A paper describes a structure:
Herpes simplex virus type-1 expresses a heterodimeric Fc receptor, gE-gI, on the surfaces of virions and infected cells that binds the Fc region of host immunoglobulin G and is implicated in the cell-to-cell spread of virus. gE-gI binds immunoglobulin G at the basic pH of the cell surface and releases it at the acidic pH of lysosomes, consistent with a role in facilitating the degradation of antiviral antibodies.
Here we identify the C-terminal domain of the gE ectodomain (CgE) as the minimal Fc-binding domain and present a 1.78-Å CgE structure. The CgE fold lacks the disulfide bond that joins the A′GFCC′C′′ and the DEBB′A sheets in the canonical Ig fold, with CgE containing a cysteine in strand F (Cys359) but a valine in the complementary position in strand B (Val244). However, the conserved tryptophan normally found in strand C adjacent to the intersheet disulfide bond is present in CgE (Trp262). Even within the region of CgE that resembles an Ig V domain, CgE has a different disulfide-bonding pattern and is longer and more open than others in the Ig superfamily. The structural effects of insertions after gE positions 277 and 291 are difficult to interpret due to their location near disulfide bonds in the third β-sheet of CgE.
Residue numbers in the entry:
A (entry chain B): 219 to 396
B (entry chain A): 218 to 396
Amino acid sequence: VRGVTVRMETPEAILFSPGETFSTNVSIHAIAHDDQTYSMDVVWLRFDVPTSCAEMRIYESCLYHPQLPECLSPADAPCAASTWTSRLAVRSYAGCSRTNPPPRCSAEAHMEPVPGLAWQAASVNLEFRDASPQHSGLYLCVVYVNDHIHAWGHITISTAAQYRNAVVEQPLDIEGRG
Amino acid sequence: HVRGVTVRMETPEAILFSPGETFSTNVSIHAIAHDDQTYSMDVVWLRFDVPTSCAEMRIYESCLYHPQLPECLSPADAPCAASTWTSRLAVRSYAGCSRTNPPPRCSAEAHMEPVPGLAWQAASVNLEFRDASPQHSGLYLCVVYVNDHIHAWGHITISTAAQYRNAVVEQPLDIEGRG
């Protein structure tokens, strides 16, 4: 029993109307099992969801290795979230530990310039002020601990008309089912 | 770097049943080995009594990782807390697992407590209840260990409507320092 455990909770969708102001409601808890220090990076990724797509496919395995060939050029081509170039936002923490919990170890933070996009100080939730159809899409919140993904989740933030179900393409389960 | 094993679990938080019904849990568990290291895995089911006088059950999340700590062995929340255990309802063990010899294939042992109407869903981690009765009502936790360390866990309150009590997860403050 060592390392860190990260648990994330959040609804898989947020339907909004044009002109509405809202915030994501992601809950993230970090449990340090030893007295080792650790770094943490909470990263937001955004993906366009084409009208022609019946659903958006998230290549789970690709999240850990977004530089792989099959990830850079997803077979489901237009309807797949398997890699990224720019990160919508990133909140970094350094020197975290059992006695110096995440809030206190806050270090740096970055956010891409997007109309109406913002976040509270020391917060990882995203706020959309005066939202519009331009903001609709698939958003992933990925939590790294010591540069390795420890937890992740997806939220389809969209107007009802633009909404498309997000499906997680994962490897076979422990029962060998796909 | 990217190493070790990642376990993801999904399941509804409650199953309401009427006496005499036959049903099964529907837990989904995926394991992703990021390297070629060999590992062991244990899928453990824990069952907790839910007293009629409890307003709600409280799960001490941090305690699941160290069930032998004093505050976990003697939970402050009367008999309405899930924070430690002795007997394990069921355990499916896997050995010699790896990226190329994934879980189903590395299945090794399976154990289950003798309980009227309870059975291991053949080749599955789910629990099946036949001719379910009030005796089966309670708070169930499914915990997945990898190399003897919890990598994922979930809870399911399985019971009749009359015996049902909401289960709340008591967690430390979040990364924003708000709990």
